[PDB]
């Protein structure tokens, strides 16, 4: 019984900066039996509206949030 919510995604960014690839990997195909497109579509609609900030960490782009 696993569900995806905006609060859950933001929680990770609020605690530690992460990348889109890392976020998707969390529920890419671990347990949730959701289609690859569906998984991205759900997080995309939520993340896309997130309009967060980008930071250069280890020569890479990461997502960070400051409530």
């Amino acid at each position: 019984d696993v569900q995806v919510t905006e609060d859950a995604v933001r929680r990770y960014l609020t605690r530690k900066p992460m990348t889109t690839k890392d976020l998707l990997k969390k529920f890419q195909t671990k347990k949730t039996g959701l289609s690859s497109e569906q998984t991205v579509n759900v997080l995309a609609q939520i993340l896309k509206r997130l309009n967060p900030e980008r930071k250069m960490i280890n020569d890479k782009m990461h997502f960070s949030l400051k409530e």
């Binding site: 889109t20 690839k21 976020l23 998707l24 990997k25 890419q28 690859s36 497109e37 998984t39 991205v40 997080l43 995309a44 993340l47 896309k48 997130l50 309009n51 967060p52 980008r54 997502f63």
Partner: peptide, 21 residues
């Protein structure tokens, strides 16, 4: 390489936020 199609799976997500970025 060992991976390819899987990488694109995440690219779609980044493509969205890429706008507001």
């Amino acid at each position: 390489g060992s991976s390819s199609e899987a990488d694109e799976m995440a690219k779609a997500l980044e493509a969205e936020l890429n706008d507001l970025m």
